């Protein structure tokens, strides 16, 4: 048990002003605090709320060594990829979850927040990569990707693609192409003092 009663800064993450681009997902550690998870589910303002390795239904009774809140933005069609053992540009090249993943995956539409007349091009995703991503790995490199047999010398063109490409977050877009904000709660349980707990 913690022995100290400090509410956890969950608001910092969900109600954050701007969200990171999925290729450079943001990660907030959470420790030395207490928080009511069931408040989130109860709010029921979210569109996807899927948990793996633990019951969502009022499971605050448990105490974990550390918690990790990973936040980013993607499309709706792509939310299906933020789960264990899924494939796709996002799960391969941007954000991978381990197959033994014990955590929760929360996603909600943000078309009002993250759309802009004429398109929002602040949110990128990685399109080309030589190898798939290992779980919980992050790649922020921008080196020109050389698809051809000839070298690129850091110049954009055919067979010489800039690896990151922008979402076309048009306000008039279909739901599958509307921005969605995603938060992934990972529960690091180890042989160490439990610094996060439930209520009371």
């Amino acid at each position: 048990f913690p022995n100290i009663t400090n509410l956890c800064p969950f608001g910092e993450v969900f109600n954050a002003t701007r969200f990171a681009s999925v290729y450079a997902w943001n990660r907030k550690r959470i420790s030395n605090c207490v928080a009511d998870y069931s408040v989130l589910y109860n709010s029921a303002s979210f569109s996807t709320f899927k948990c793996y390795g633990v019951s969502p239904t009022k499971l605050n009774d448990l105490c974990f060594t550390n918690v990790y809140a990973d936040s980013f933005v993607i499309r709706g069609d792509e939310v299906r990829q933020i789960a264990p053992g899924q494939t796709g540009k996002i799960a391969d090249y941007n954000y991978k979850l381990p197959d033994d993943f014990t955590g929760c995956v929360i996603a909600w539409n943000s078309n009002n927040l993250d759309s802009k007349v004429g398109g929002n091009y602040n949110y990128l995703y990685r399109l080309f990569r030589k190898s798939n991503l290992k779980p919980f790995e992050r790649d922020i490199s921008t080196e020109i990707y050389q698809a051809g047999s000839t070298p690129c010398n850091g110049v954009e063109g055919f067979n010489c693609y800039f690896p990151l490409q922008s979402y076309g977050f048009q306000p008039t877009n279909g739901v599958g192409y509307q921005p969605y904000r995603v938060v992934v709660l990972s529960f690091e349980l180890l042989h160490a003092p439990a610094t996060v707990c439930g209520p009371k």
Partner: antibody
Amino acid sequence: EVQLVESGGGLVQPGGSLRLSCAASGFDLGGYSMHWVRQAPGKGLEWVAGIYASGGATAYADSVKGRFTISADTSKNTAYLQMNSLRAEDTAVYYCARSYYYGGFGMDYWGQGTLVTVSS
Amino acid sequence: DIQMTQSPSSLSASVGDRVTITCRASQSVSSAVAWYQQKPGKAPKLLIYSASDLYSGVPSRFSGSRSGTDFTLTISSLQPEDFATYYCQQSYRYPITFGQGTKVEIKR
């Protein structure tokens, strides 16, 4: 409503020249790459040439390298394929299409196509 | 200069069946494959891009998959409009190359 319309197709003798035009509407050529894809009767699809409208960079298929020349105009918002030293093998339906970026993406919109016949 | 080998060359199946079409690339193309549908006398219509991304205005039955350098197009259930020819296309290394083609014919 994005639209792509071909024009300039016709009949030409072997060794002649013919310039196909592809007028685009509902979008600006900037940031896109325009391609010419031909289909011989009852056969597969074969890519021919492509151009990044903004920078002007071009790319051609080995089978027609040198004979053909792809160009674009940003004020007219149209793309052109000049075809010189034509051969009977080049007889086909010529479509124009667009893709995002220099590559990695598909062809969103295709024109209805124009027939080119190369016969004496 | 990559080669896209497409199978099957021809396929006959009944309405409501689930269909699978495969395209194998000579080299790695990351996820730069696309799938098109063509009916007689009409331009190709874009179905899938970047391997597994649906295009706007395209029935959700169409799905796309990538296993290494093998790419797959799947129809959950066939409909009378889905009878036509299907091509795969790669936009990784120029010149961009299409597949030989897969014709889908209604069984009778």
